[PDB]
Design a protein around this ligand. Structure first.
Ligand code: NAG
Lengths: 49, 46
């Protein structure tokens, strides 16, 4: 660890890239599924012709 | 020759908290407007 202390920039950029990917996954899910702002409920009656 | 003190009023040793004290310059190189990471023998905070 004391030897690796001089590669802090390399580790910081690695963790930054991975954190960006991780946030991007949640963003992708939000764009795909969270388009509708209201949670509509199915009607009790299913008279859909 | 020395004299051994005989009057004694002893209590348990008190303890206090070191509020971010005991930091020293790790080297003799001038550094300005930089943020530097170093491992050494330091007095841990608090
Ligand atoms: C005080 O210092 C002297 C020096 O030798 C020592 O002999 C003596 O034992 C010391 N006092 C006590 C109570 O130990």
């Amino acid at each position: 660890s004391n030897l690796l202390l001089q590669y802090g920039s390399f580790c910081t950029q690695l963790n930054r890239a991975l954190t960006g990917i991780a946030v991007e996954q949640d963003k992708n899910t939000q764009e795909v599924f969270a388009q509708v702002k209201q949670i509509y409920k199915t009607p009790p009656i299913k008279d859909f012709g | 020759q020395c004299v051994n003190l005989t009057t004694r009023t002893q209590l348990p040793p008190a303890y206090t908290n070191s509020f971010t004290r005991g930091v020293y310059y790790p080297d003799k190189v001038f550094r300005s407007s930089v943020l530097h990471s170093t491992q050494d023998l330091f007095l841990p905070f608090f």
